[model samples]
Target: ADWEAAMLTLLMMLKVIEKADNAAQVLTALWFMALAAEMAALATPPKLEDKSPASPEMIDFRVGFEELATEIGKAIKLAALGKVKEAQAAAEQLKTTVNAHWQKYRGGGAADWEAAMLTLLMMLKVIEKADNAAQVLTALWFMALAAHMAALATPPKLEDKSPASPEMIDFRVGFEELATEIGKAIKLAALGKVKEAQAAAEQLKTTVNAHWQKYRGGAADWEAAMLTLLMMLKVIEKADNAAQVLTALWFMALAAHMAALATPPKLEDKSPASPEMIDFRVGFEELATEIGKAIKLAALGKVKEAQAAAEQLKTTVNAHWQKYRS
Candidate 1:
């Protein structure tokens, strides 16, 4: 199937951003990635200027891109050092810059790249305290990539833009608190701060009880999203090894899925699955089964087998999604 090549650009660009070593490395990587995406869209149907020279405005934007890259690199570097709260703030400001950059391109081919950046920023938001940060980054990547592929067939279509209900507003906060605390415990435990880890775990339980269902009444069936989320946590609480890293993938997937949806989905699908829907669900089933296999292996103390399965799962998902590109 010939999918719009531009959408695939987001995934491809992120693959490179993961490898970048410095500011110019990320800056130049993004620049060429966008350029390559535009080139992939042959110019039969145009979007903007293709047959034009460097207007001063274009020159200015190009020059400014390095500055933008400079700051974004700094933010990413800070996040690596456990300064996530500040890095997140800095990353948030770049959304407008990315949006404007898209307009200057002949085709609005930057959508995928911009979406990739958005996904990364959301991950940054989720990891504000960062302890077991490296593996958490891996965990975050797979979850986001998984959810994105799963939802490709049918994005939530409800159009009303009203703010989420007060109940939902409160639960969302609780979810964030719970996720961060879980990650924190892993960090504290890893650092031999057993007391701190215990405290963080207690705090997690307290937060869970506090906002767990205080506002379920007024929210739309978004309540169902919470159920799946809790099921993911259940798996986490049972694991003996790498539990925090495991849970990070679960909620990062959830967070990415939710942020991507303008129209929240209900638990049940009202209509029969479309052809595209069948394909997407099939992919997700394979994904879920592999993850389960990995989890079970972990349960059995087959750590080597489980680690191998997890890596294979990641490769399988990436290859399956690659066919959707133009």
Candidate 2:
């Protein structure tokens, strides 16, 4: 189960990386890792005599790493040798192979916590390395990863072997507190409390840094830390002042409105209603939803929608503020 979980993690990490970078190297590395994971699974002997009985897979992390490392080395060499086309082709092939393997083992019980963490870490790396082209995908990956990580960090029942450890319990508590502070800061910013939001962002950064210091090794850990920091930076940028927060809020509100409009009706085609679409009767509720969506969209890099939403939200808030003040 552990080995299968590890493989799933590797698969998700590769998927996010490929989505973010779309480079030949990323694709090739993903392919190598996927193959290595599968081979490791196969190499391990099954535990029970019954055909239905589960088996423990053997995953030599070193072996998978080395295999991926070799593929990367080859890609680099090909690129350096001016075999650009060849390198690209190789990468495409790797991507195809990885996708094929995933399809074959798409819905197995092999998925677990470590895999979830690995996925989140990869997402964080994507955010850290994002440009205009990669921002949206990175942001989506970040949200998905964060949600998954949060779930994994939650305590499990007695029957579950994947129960959260003491360390994880502490981490989850701290993370939740930090996430709440960030939310509060966003609210303040939406309410035109620039200094308060900035302070909140700073505090969030401090908490994230402290957490990073405690677990700062391996590619996955580094990626997780990087993602947290990037999120903080993004909040600070968006909520710098009344104008900025207002702009952000409007964008979010508009997105909610537009999404509501665009949603298809019917069982199969129906869109899940967004929380942002809930009644914006009160200023706090409006601000909270707007700010929350803004934070989420910004991290996910919904640039056009984010911008438009912010503008619309800003206009709405300003009008409301003026009416209330008068």
Candidate 3:
């Protein structure tokens, strides 16, 4: 629950960033958001500051997360001073830190997973300026978020630091390629380079089709959900506005929810239908639906209503996850 709270806090912060009227406003909003994110981060696992005589792996983990914390702090400070370029650079550097360290631990069960997600969200703000590089970075961060969600659907034990199975390795490789190409398409399409973007999307489609055909599974399987996620990206590439892009993002969120339900983690028990497990799945879908509602309001140009919807969604998700999560 704390983990989800951290993630949702970062998402809310993003909404604030999106609505900012100027660089100063963006900085002011992010200052408070960063504090909230940090507080939420403290609520999650691995109080690395309290540990002593740590294993080599623990030391590495602490280094990774602490470095992320440092970057987050730096970015917020720069943004608060209206140093847009500096803040963006800090955010970009934060992404490098996170990507280098995230896969060292398994998806949802990682000790610092909450920090990882929050950091990714921070790195994606793009400040008050939008450029081709910013667009690509934003798409890449979303891809990372969705990929992490897919991984959470079938996580390994928290303490098991063993090498991943060959199947999972293959899945990871395929996912990386898929995410990269889709990210490229999103930016190209946004830049009005639709011809190239569409070409890449078509190529990606063939690859996705081939991958699914080679590793066929039932409707609820993770691979199936990933296929659905890729389909959502196809919609995203065609999105003519921010609202449409967000709409597709919520759909991807729903796909992630279905995947989680199909392979519910045994956090509290090994039972397949455990109450906590069911609640988690249900709660995720509710959050995604709420996100959809917010996107609809935004599409209609109802900024105040959309903000309210996002606020309600964050509160509801936090409450539900607090009650149900392990």
Candidate 4:
């Protein structure tokens, strides 16, 4: 995956850092964040040829990331011991330091790095102390920020790939099932059924593995698979009373995998098909849009309207498959 994908992964992990019940999960998220940071550094332009030493700027960038990671670990530890106040202080210190560093390095072509780290820092502040509602709103803002980053980064084009194959169809169906489970979890949480929500949230792990079992990994679409799992982590991490957070993560994840699966075909002439032949990615996006619309309506307590949208989504999906099948 590219820097943007990795950054998205990093943002997703912050949800874990925010709501994880134990140190193990928090650390898991931290490690991934570290990986994302490393990826960004490695991907910094003016490439370092094989066996060449890293540039001074790259070294400094990497060192900055290590310091940030260390501070996050400290904060998490302090938080674990219930020193939330101290943990918050640590986060504040980190945020200040990061800003100063970015200011100093901005002239050195570190804007991309600066943007991503600062975004993480901002999200970390909310994660540390914000209530569920605040967290949810900040998460939505974070996702919007992420999409902005993607515009510059150009990670992958979801609509640029070939028409649907059986594999694409199967993967899309798998994701639809996976999403329903996530939706149930979110809805249950929103309705204030914590116990049921937790169970439904936990069921995500099993459901995801089921998709993997049938789809089997190390495929050419490994990046998409990786993104899928990363989103799964975010969903589990945000399972705590944050229903809106789950919805935000759910929709963001939906976009991630769609792009991930849409890697451009190697052959220019894979086929010269009829103009009416559906681009499955477009269909997938429509499906995702309908699902997102339904979720919003349901949130607004328009249950019947939500069901109506879901019904249309099914009809749209069936029509797409039927048309694509030929």
Candidate 5:
């Protein structure tokens, strides 16, 4: 979710603009030329029109986002024009305009990136000037540093996903399940009945809680699942268009719950998978298959077929968890 990928890309383009005198090389132009069309998507609103705005801030945020995208697009367009002096100026403008402010809030200081860029730009001067041998190898030289500095941006993705213990898998698996429904909920909030989506969410929470009771599930698990459902509703109710994504945040609350769960109790006896556990997994697999069927049919607008598959999941659960249910 960090836009450092986007920023890294912007960095390279700026380097080229200042270093290569702004006009993209024939090759660079070939790839970057297409950004013109795709960038429009960057400006597109995050949510579909589902309902009226409940608060003024709901509309204001999109306005700011659109404004920022517009400014960035303008900056990008300036360098694409291919005039050397103008392009050099375009580089400066982009730096002063978007890069400084963008970094100010996201990175601790805009001065750092600007300072690094200035130094990197001067370094590339040799690469820009000398081409046949070591100068060309210069690009390779800078890449090593570039790769490491970029190291900062990438660590966050993996750092957050790893759960310390094996038991954590249960909560993670449940999070994924809830995550899948978020997309469904967002889409439904925009196009389908709110009542049905709410029903679906309640059903999910109920099922998870019932299983919590059945499978040594606890208050924390119940609390987290219910909270996710609650947050999903709150977002939709607040004129946030994020049902699929709108309420995308609810699953995050499960992290600590899962982490705590994964941390085995001090004196509890440990054993291999129970028969009931194995059956739960097998039934979950069957339910997974049913979900695939449901999505496939749903995608084609086959409502009844999708519903049938969804209903089939309940049967699968009942069959697999019969002993637990008893």
Candidate 6:
């Protein structure tokens, strides 16, 4: 299976390169390259101690991928050395080999191959900065996969887990960080900080694309990553003003509600209804509704009304928590 997959990938690379002049061709070429890179990474030889029957065919696989990697490296070096035409020619040839590989093995597994192809295309789109529309959409797709992967990779916490347990919430926080970075990038782009925005965009794209490519066959994982990515993008694109902020708040509220329901029980014994555990859901909803109204007012361009709404939400959330404690 490993050797066949390797050969198929190489053939796909060849076909893509042959058809490189068309826009679809170029896109396909890039996709194939991304997949090839991912497959090669998976196939590379591992240490003897790391060898297992279930482990990816690291030893035999290197024979196929090492040469490709070396060729890509050389092409990159040539490009760096100002041999632009030579580098382009080499890249084109490499792409063609990968494309042919895909065409030959295209029928064996429908779902897995489709996923692999989509993952590859999405990654390539992100890497190339294909377009704002493509970037945003593809980034969302990539994030969904990432979030799903996170869910799978993380073990379920036992009921009674500590409030401060890092494992309990690290993934959620990590996702939030990703969203925040994307928000900053969008804002920067909006404000004409093209370079900084581009850097941020690229960083976010790289993080997402890499995950998708590396975990190509994990459909469930991909879906989760996409959802998170979309949520973040929606927040950035639609939640810019007070009105949008409210919309965002509402979404966050929904997220909080869903999280409350979906989150795994703690791994410890002190898990009874404390204010901290019980209030999370209610507090989030109340805050969301208040913020939603405020956002609506802001959307209507009612600055004072929006500000009032914001004040009301803050006051209510704080007051509610205070009361809950008492």
Number of the top candidate by TM-score? 4
Regions of candidate 5 where Cα sits further than 4 Å from its true position: 26-65, 71-81, 107-326
Candidate 6 local lDDT, 1-326, one digit each (tens): 13333344344444444444533333333333433343335432213235664545444444445556455444433333345456558777766544553343333441122232343344435535544443443333333322322332322332345446865465445544644554444444433344565566677656545543443443211122223323433453433453334333333332332233332224123343765556545654565455445434544456566556555555664564344322
Instruction: Give candidate 6's error at residue 25 in angstroms.
Output: 8.0
Please report how far candidate 6 places residue 278 from its true position, in Å: 24
Instruction: Name model 2 segments beyond 4 Å from true.
Output: 1-165, 218-326
Model 6 segments more than 4 A misplaced: 1-7, 21-34, 43-60, 76-84, 91-132, 135-224, 228-326
Superposed Cα RMSD, model 1: 22.7
Task: Name the 10 consecutive residues with the lowest summed lDDT in model 2.
Answer: 219-228
Q: Rate the local accuracy (lDDT) of all candidates.
A: 0.39, 0.38, 0.47, 0.42, 0.34, 0.42
Name the lDDT value of residue 46 in candidate 1: 36
Task: Name every residue pair that clashes in candidate 2.
Answer: 139-300, 246-314, 247-310, 250-309, 250-312, 250-313, 251-309, 251-310, 252-309
lDDT of 1 by residue, 50-164 (tens): 4343656545644555454444444443443344455445445644455455445434443222233333334334434446433333333322332232221111221222237
- Candidate 5 residue-wise lDDT at 152: 24
Q: Which should have the higher lDDT, number 2 or number 4? A: 4
lDDT of 4 by residue, 27-132 (tens): 3344344434533444432232322346676676567666765565455445434554565555457556545544544323311322232333334333335454
On residues 199-309, what C-alpha lDDT tens digit does candidate 3 reach at each position? 555675565556444444331333334444445555555545544444444544544543465542235454548775666667666765565555555544555565555
Model 5 residue pairs with clashes: 182-244, 183-244, 186-243, 186-244, 242-246, 243-246
TM-score of 3: 0.29
Rank ordering of all candidates by TM-score, starting from the highest: 4, 6, 2, 3, 1, 5
Backbone clashes counted, model 1: 0
Query: What is the lDDT ranking, best to worst?
Result: 3, 4, 6, 1, 2, 5
Q: What are the clash counts of all predictions, listed in order?
A: 0, 9, 0, 0, 6, 44
